[PDB]
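Thread title: Can someone regenerate the structure for this chain?

I was given the following input by a collaborator and told the matching structure tokens would be attached. They weren't. Posting the sequence so someone can regenerate them.
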Amino acid sequence: KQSVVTLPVYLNFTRADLIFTVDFEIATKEDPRSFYERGVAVLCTE
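Best answer:
Regenerated them for you:
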């Protein structure tokens, strides 16, 4: 019920279908700005 990086989850590689969102913990020296710029996401099928 109750930094941090949020990543979309897509069903296939084309990223045309969004299922749900996942919040991940970022490492010490990494950058959420870079993570958002690089288009990091989660795919269900590949």
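Residues 5 and 35 are 8 Å apart (CA to CA).
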